[PDB]
Amino acid sequence: VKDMCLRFAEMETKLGEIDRARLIYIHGSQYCRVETDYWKAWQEFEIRYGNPEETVKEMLRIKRSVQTKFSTDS
Amino acid sequence: SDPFVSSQRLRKQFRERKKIEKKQEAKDLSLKNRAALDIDILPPSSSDKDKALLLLDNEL
Amino acid sequence: IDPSIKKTEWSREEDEKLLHLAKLLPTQWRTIAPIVGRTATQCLERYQKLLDDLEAKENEQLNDPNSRLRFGEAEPNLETLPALPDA
Amino acid sequence: RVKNKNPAPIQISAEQLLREAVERQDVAFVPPKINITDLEELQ
């Protein structure tokens, strides 16, 4: 799903909208080791279009929650 | 001694703490509706803050 | 003993319900218990624990258990205690 | 020293009580079957 989500978010950024782009990034971070394809583009959009104090804490929180979900069963 | 003065002290202590707690859960549940999230959201803690600037330092 | 009793930790909603009821009906725990959902002894012990906890958190920054202090500790009711582990 | 207050690794459970109580039963009583060797006892 992230395969189309990334292109659609790029198109959304090209149009001039940022909120729904990050919204679909968190939406796609919900479908699902060696899964760097998620985080590489996720953090790339974070660096290119993200504020230091406004947004980083919550989405790094979500990253930690996803990793804990993965680590719960092993 | 006081079934009313002491009651307010328990009510005060509870009441202001639930306000900050309801603040977080209202904030986090609003984000999951606009994202169709299905997982529990844990408190930010100091660990995320320590990692946040560490992540942020390499960004800039 | 009966399975209807909720021995789990106190949720926050039932805790505020207990606070509100204990304000509304002073004493009268046998009628507060059905509305809260726990047993009367559980409600009384939880209320006492909340008052003692508030006093403990009050001491850091600064009710008269002195009246309760002038005598010994409360003798636990035999039927409400957890069963002794078997040897 | 018969003073091993140490809590048991296997605590007694109710279902255990009912199971081991029922265990007192055995198979149905087996009587030696009567042998009809002649006609009159058949009758």
Pairwise CB contact (< 8 Å): B37 & A60: no
Residues counted in chain D: 43
Nearest Cα of chain A lies from the Cα of B16 at a distance, in angstroms, of 23
- Expt. technique: cryo-EM
A34: alpha, beta or left, given left = phi > 0 and alpha = psi -120 to 50?
left
Between the two ends of chain B, the Cα-to-Cα distance in Å is 60
CB A30 within 8 A of CB A39: no
Q: Which residues in chain D are closer than 8 Å to C87, comparing Cβ atoms?
A: 4-8
Provide long-range contacts, Cβ within 8 A and 24+ apart, for C78-87: C80/C39, C80/C41, C85/D7, C85/D8, C85/D11, C86/D7, C86/D8, C86/D11, C86/D12, C87/D4, C87/D5, C87/D6, C87/D7, C87/D8
d(CA C44, CA B42): 32
- State whether residue D9 is helix, strand or coil: coil
Q: What six digits make up the tokens of C12?
A: 């926050």
d(CA A37, CA A43): 10
State which residue of chain B sits closest to A22, comparing Cα positions.
B35
| D14 touching chain C per CB within 8 A | no
Q: Which residues in chain B are closer than 8 Å to C15, comparing Cβ atoms?
A: 14
In Å, how far are A56, A66, C73, D18, D29 from D32, measured between CA atoms?
87, 72, 71, 32, 10
Chain B contacts to A (CB-CB under 8 A): 31, 34-42, 44, 47-49, 51-52, 55-56, 59
Question: What interhelical angle do C40-61 and C12-24 show, nearest 10?
Answer: 90
d(CA C65, CA C67): 5
Q: What six digits make up the tokens of A70?
A: 């993965």
- Residue of D28, B36, B7 lying closest to A27 (CA atoms): B36
d(CA D26, CA D24): 7
Count interface pairs C-D at CB distance under 8 A: 12
Provide long-range contacts, Cβ within 8 A and 24+ apart, for B44-48: B44/A57, B44/A58, B44/A61, B47/A64, B48/A57, B48/A60, B48/A61, B48/A64
Residue with tokens 């690794």: D9
d(CA C70, CA B33): 57
| B3 touching chain C per CB within 8 A | yes
Residue with tokens 């009711």: C77
CB C47 within 8 A of CB C22: yes
d(CA B11, CA D30): 74
